């Protein structure tokens, strides 16, 4: 692999002092780029997403436009459970959901052995090295995947949900199956996240996007043990295959009672939603962990002026050390790609300005 | 009126010690029970909520089953802004919607002068005076309406939403038009409150259920000023009338960045979601509020075992002093009856007993 050139957004992760805060945004290869829909246009969405190039090309867009800190492999969180053995229909501009959702215990028996998935997203590994490759060391190269308790919800809610009353219902009413299943996902990630490692993956991102939905108590029970479990055994299989580990970020949307426990999670970056205060973040997190985040996506639909004294005001509260900056969510479809400029920009020529 | 005889709740409301600690549930008057959709099957809706005695009977019906410690009127939030000129369709199963959302800043032009929406709502003082009487003081009769910022969310995305992204953008894009329609909201709310109290509402409570979409900037600026307002002006206006001011609740779902102001807000309670921890809301609050909630709904998907021992938990955690029994959210039309029989008798049962 290409040497790395540019590489402040790692050593922001590993909590040392660089000469600016690094920038990048959640889903910054996205709708909002007209380019992104062109290209989608191929087929239709996983029909797409099969192919090395495409998702090699969709990665790289977002670079051409703007000077991000970080590229991210364009994927969908949902290939995990498409990988068990679930099948996704990607309704026309209402996005991809499982038609067959699973609803009791025995809809856990259509699933494929955790240890095969890997094998089964080898066109995911492909897209890495394509990527990695094509990049030439510009900047760093993120894999992803969802957090066993957010792939739980989508398995078993089908889709997306105000409530997640149904997933929940299954940890109250369905405890020990809840646990199987939350164990068979946690199996395939380990090996997903190593596999994307190895393809060439420069850091690990875990999306636990649907976290704020559950209490202290069901969270510590049923999300906390194998968020903390895919860091542990991650780390673990790269160490003995020879391999460097990766700076590793935990993304727990609307999870700020579970911040503190996050930061001794065994992650070197804690990624926060817009919900939470900067400098109350710190509290709860401490000197040990990088901070990621947190801007309001849609405070780009403010004026390019006003997202620069917005942005001034994030990288006040969060201070210099320790912190990469990104959103709160992703880009909505809908953004202006000038006013995503304007933010890239802004953390750019702020951090300079706040460290004279 | 008649006097009233269980007195409980208004107690624990104004921070008085009680013998046991008082419990309602949001939604008590919800389709989980079956004499419920018997009931709202007289037409739709919205056309079955403008007969007082209707609205009487949706009301006193869970009181029939369990021996809640307050009943709040049957209505719904969305009354205020159909009372503003907005037209309402009950889609068959989806829920109350607005099918012309307001969209831009001439939109505001449809809506009533805020002034005379109190004479639009009579149907709903006449069925709190109904209401009161055929209670015949067993217990309070909790007011109730939609916060200023969530009824704007409602009106401006047309019904639910998981990003607010329709509404954010007129507070980022459309800053003053926002605080102009924020100030109907706010000026339309008053008068149906005080509205409420003058027919015989013992309490009211504030649903600020949108809050957690907002940041705390965000939510300074468009969401806390007009929840001051409300309980100042509405307190004012009674004391003014010769009435005697009513306890206020103000419900900021997912609104823990919020806690510490809205306990400066002017309201005697302030009711939590499941996401806060008990004794970390106690701490954000201080001493001279009262806390209510916090039950994770689904959690009545447990067993009457599990749901007693829940409820065990809870109590031990809010400690007996200025404490309100309730849900994080209302209750889910799926549930069992019984189950939310197990929740009520636990909290009297455990209270006591906590108390010894």
Same mark, same amino acid.
């Given at each position: ?17 660089? *000469?600016?805060?690094?920038? %990048?945004?959640?889903?910054?290869? &996205? ?11 191929? /087929? ?68 494929? *052995? ?5 094998? !089964? ?37 089908? &889709? &997306?949900?105000?409530?997640? #009353?149904?997933?929940?219902? %299954?940890?109250? /009413?369905?405890?020990? #199956? ?17 596999? /994307? ?15 704020? =939905? ?14 903390? *479990? ?40 804690? &990624?926060?939603? %817009? ?29 390019? !002026? ?9 990288? *006040? ?21 000038? =006013? ?15 460290? /004279?």
């Amino acid at each position: 692999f290409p040497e790395l050139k540019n590489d402040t957004f790692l050593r922001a992760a590993w909590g040392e002092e660089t *000469d600016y805060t690094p920038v %990048w945004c959640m889903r910054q290869a &996205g709708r909002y780029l007209p380019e992104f829909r062109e290209t989608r246009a191929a /087929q239709d969405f996983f029909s797409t997403c099969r192919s090395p190039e495409a998702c090699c090309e969709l990665t790289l867009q977002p670079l051409r436009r703007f000077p991000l800190d970080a590229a991210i492999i364009f994927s969908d969180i949902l290939v995990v459970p498409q990988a068990l053995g679930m099948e996704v229909t990607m309704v026309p501009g209402k996005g991809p959901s499982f038609p067959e959702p699973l609803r009791e215990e025995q809809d856990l028996e259509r699933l494929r *052995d955790p240890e095969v998935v890997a094998s !089964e997203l080898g066109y995911v590994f492909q897209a890495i090295t394509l990527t990695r490759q094509r990049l030439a060391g510009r900047v760093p190269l993120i894999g992803f995947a969802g957090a066993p308790w957010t792939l739980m919800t989508y398995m078993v809610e089908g &889709g &997306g949900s105000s409530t997640m #009353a149904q997933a929940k219902r %299954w940890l109250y /009413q369905r405890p020990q #199956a809840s646990h199987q299943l939350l164990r068979i996902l946690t199996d395939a990630l380990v090996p997903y996240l190593v596999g /994307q490692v190895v393809a060439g993956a420069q850091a690990l991102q875990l999306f636990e996007s649907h976290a704020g =939905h559950l209490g202290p108590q069901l969270f510590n029970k049923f999300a906390l043990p194998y968020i903390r *479990d895919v860091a542990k055994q991650v780390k673990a299989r790269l160490r003995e295959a020879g391999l460097a580990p990766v700076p590793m970020i935990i993304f727990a949307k609307d999870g700020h009672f579970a911040l503190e426990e996050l930061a001794q999670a065994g992650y070197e970056v804690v &990624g926060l939603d %817009w919900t939470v205060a900067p400098k109350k973040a710190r509290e709860c997190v401490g000197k040990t962990v990088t901070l990621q985040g947190n801007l309001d996506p849609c405070a780009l639909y403010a004026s390019e !002026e006003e997202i620069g004294q917005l942005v001034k005001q994030m990288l *006040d509260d969060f201070g210099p050390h320790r912190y990469i900056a990104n959103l709160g969510h992703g880009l909505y479809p809908d953004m202006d790609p000038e =006013h995503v400029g304007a933010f890239v920009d802004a953390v750019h020529k702020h951090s300079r300005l706040l460290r /004279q």
